[PDB]
Amino acid sequence: EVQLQESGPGLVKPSQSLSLTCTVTGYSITSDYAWNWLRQLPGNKLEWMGYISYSGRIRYNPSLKRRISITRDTSKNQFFLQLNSVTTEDTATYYCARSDYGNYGRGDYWGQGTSVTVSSAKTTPPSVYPLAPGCGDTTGSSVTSGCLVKGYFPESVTVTWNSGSLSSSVHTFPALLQSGLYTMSSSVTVPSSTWPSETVTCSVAHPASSTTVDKKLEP
Amino acid sequence: DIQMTQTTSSLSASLGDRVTISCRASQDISNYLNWYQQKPDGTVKLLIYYTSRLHSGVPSRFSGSGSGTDYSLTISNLDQDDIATYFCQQGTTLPPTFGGGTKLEIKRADAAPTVSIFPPSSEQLTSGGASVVCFLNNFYPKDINVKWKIDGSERQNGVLNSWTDQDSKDSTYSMSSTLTLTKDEYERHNSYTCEATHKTSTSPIVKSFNRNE
After folding, report:
1. Total CB pairs under 8 A between chain A and B
2. Annotation: CATH topology of B108-211
3. Min Cα separation B14/chain A (Å)
4. What are the boundaries of each domain within chain B?
5. Is B1-107 a domain of CATH 3.40.190.10?
6. Where are the alpha helices (DSSP H) in B11-140?
7. Cβ of B163 and A44 within 8 Å?
8. How many angstroms away from the CA of A133 is the closest CA of chain B?
């Protein structure tokens, strides 16, 4: 029943500092153990950043010790990271974790990670485009439809579908930078007898821009 | 910094198999090795600590061995749920340092992709752009080639492909390919093709459409 979850801004401009919070629950951060910041950079290269003990002792990765500061707030049972002078190299998914203080040095509970991007690039809402078969394309046993979410920044995007049938297999394709801006897509497959009968629409939520569009898919 | 090295980063095996992932340290680390499993969604879990001890919860089919600089994780009776990347961590000196990871793919019966092509939407075309899209769904193995042919002529430039992780339920992969060009480029050519070449088939799987229809 011990749980950690991190949170903070997903976009940060170069040269500014990055602040994240981890929120611990099910366990006091004062009782025992060490509490850690780690991050995973592109190419899956996993790097430890620091900890703060239950006793308030603090330790940093030498590579980062010029620019890093871990603090805690035992009232709210929280600990915090601050990384100054961020460049784009500092783009990674950041992770809080609990460990042995000493002995085996094992991380026994982790947050789910939070992705942070360092760019001066402006936040942008997506364009959402429906993907329906070309009218000549007479089909068979079932039908695939999709959304195209294009020209947005930063990541991430949630795409969710509604139709009628819980026999709907979805796929979500990871986003890619198309000249400065991102683009992603998603497919759904449905029995060919449920469409165009039963309406099908997708929902594309972009928090950084705080936006949601819903496209219906027409024949 | 103790440097950790997992010389293999890709691994593929059948359900029920036994698989070893190996880990090597720049210097003696005296059995303080930990093993972590990261799922494609990025959740992270400790498997084994201090070379061989099982973290509370972790299936016994997980085990570890090693001394000095050389260590190994062993997953046996391999499971659909075991699709993840496996990381070794040295816990002897600060900073703690991790390996590069080993991705584990579960094997699966060969599977031909279900392919679909889609023309630009009405809306995008108003916006002055035009993107033709192609799904190639549920295939194995992951290895696959896609060609775009515009009026028969191959197109390399401006194609964006995107693969999914191996499906955690049926052990397949999927991919989207997107050809983007201007509305004017689009409107200056009649037929758009999407050719898939894949192990499962000696000749390509070709889907396309014609604007003149």
Report:
1. 128
2. Immunoglobulin-like (2.60.40)
3. 24
4. 1-107, 108-211
5. no
6. 122-126
7. no
8. 6
